Symmetry: C2
Subunit: 220 residues, 2 copies
């Protein structure tokens, strides 16, 4: 047929590529997904997914999931459906993306490593508890903010909010499920409100459905 | 006298605020440093340093060290001495900042936690080795790139390069010093070249000197 605009190098299990999948569906953009078995370093020297190739921009490549989000909205969100136009809003949107990238992803991922996805002999629930506690602390930070604002930035849905979704879903369903009586809605009602709003959006729900189906299809 | 432009909430031991200290000195900007004992959540809901108050911009506040770097150069680097002007360069500069924020800081910090700065009973050199190995992997990523480019972006010094300095110095002097025969110049000569270029810059050297002096003055 005709070449789609984007290649998203993604992974069925790993959360981070699905931030980008969510945004591409939200904006209605055309992309193929390549699930990478975890070249590729030719597209990202760090050797990690996601990476994005923009075939309609001379095969421009961007890696780091949150940098990909910014690229997409800076080039392909002219009506600012999921982004912002003023300088002040832009820098605060970037602030919250860096909090996601440095404060959620890595620490949620260490909980996942020691609880769930390391080789079984290397899993360690005692060490994992350090990062389960960090998950709850991050939830507490989000709670203190979202108790008094609808969205993170400019009172509108942006990629700042979207960037938190996939790891938050992983945390609630897996990483802190059953941890010391954790109850998402009771313990962090504002985060629950915000998260539930996000995952019930058609495009985001479609992304989560696609991820589940993709896991079901990957053998094993 | 007269109020300085910026307040940098910093810490003597913690690396991350010193990225911002480096940039402010490089640009010759006026700032006071407040060393926070580790309000403050009034300036950052995450409750972490650094945070920046811009008194000449109606006390605008930005937190997350790499978001602070972007704020400073986007508003106060009109000649692009440590930043870039084209879209393509801007997005790749942001890409490398997100790699620093998500791939260096957090994993280097976990090595520091389990090796060096956790309460002594909670330190664990076996667990630390997971993150010492991640330090070397990050060095290997930087090596593969810096063997064929002088600086990370646009063949010029930017905040992308500066953002890596403080954690790299901590890693070489502490976190992987003596780890399995680690020798910075022999094992990662390109990273060593780049890092040495950075720390010998007067403003960056001044920042590192100030940090050492600040540790020497903080009692204990
Ligand atoms: N900051 C990067 C992180 C990208 C990333 O982590 N990609 C994973 C797939 S998501 S899977 C989640 C991922 N876990 C892992 O990657 C587990 C393997 C790893 N080497 C380890 O030892 O921890 C993690 O914890 N991420 C922390 C974060 O989100 O910031 C990958 O490619 N792994 C290949 C490999 O490791 O060899 C981004 O957002 O793009
Ligand atoms: N991404 C943020 C990280 C900022 C940050 O980590 N600030 C530290 C001082 S630098 S000191 C380095 C810091 N270690 C710590 O903060 C140790 C305490 C922590 N609660 C823990 O249990 O790990 C770390 O590992 N950082 C990972 C990274 O750079 O991304 C802080 O305020 N700590 C107060 C507290 O923890 O209560 C940024 O760059 O601004
Ligand atoms: O990558 N992880 O660290 C991780 C951990 C726990 C769960 C899942 N998950 O459900 O896809 C992923
Ligand atoms: O904060 N840390 O994780 C850390 C670790 C190891 C060393 C230093 N240091 O030297 O300032 C800091």
């Amino acid at each position: 047929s005709h070449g789609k605009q984007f290649t998203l190098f993604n992974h069925q299990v790993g959360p981070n590529g699905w931030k980008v999948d969510m945004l591409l569906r939200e904006l209605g953009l055309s992309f193929e997904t390549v699930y990478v078995n975890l070249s590729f370093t030719k597209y990202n020297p760090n050797g990690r997914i996601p990476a994005l190739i923009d075939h309609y921009y001379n095969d421009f490549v961007v890696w780091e999931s949150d940098a990909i989000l910014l690229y997409i909205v800076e080039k392909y969100d002219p009506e600012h459906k999921f982004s912002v136009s003023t300088f002040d809003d832009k820098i605060i949107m970037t602030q919250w993306l860096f909090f996601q990238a440095s404060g959620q992803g890595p620490y949620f991922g260490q909980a996942g490593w020691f609880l769930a996805v390391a080789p079984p002999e290397e899993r360690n629930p005692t060490i994992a508890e350090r990062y389960q506690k960090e998950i709850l602390r991050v939830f507490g930070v989000l709670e203190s903010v979202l108790s008094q604002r609808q969205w993170l930035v400019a009172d509108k849905l942006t990629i700042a909010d979207i960037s938190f979704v996939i790891w938050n879903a992983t945390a609630v369903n897996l990483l802190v499920k059953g941890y010391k009586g954790f109850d998402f809605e009771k313990d962090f009602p504002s985060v629950h409100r915000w998260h539930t709003a996000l995952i019930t959006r058609p495009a985001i729900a479609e992304s989560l459905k696609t991820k589940a189906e993709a896991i079901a299809q990957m053998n094993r």
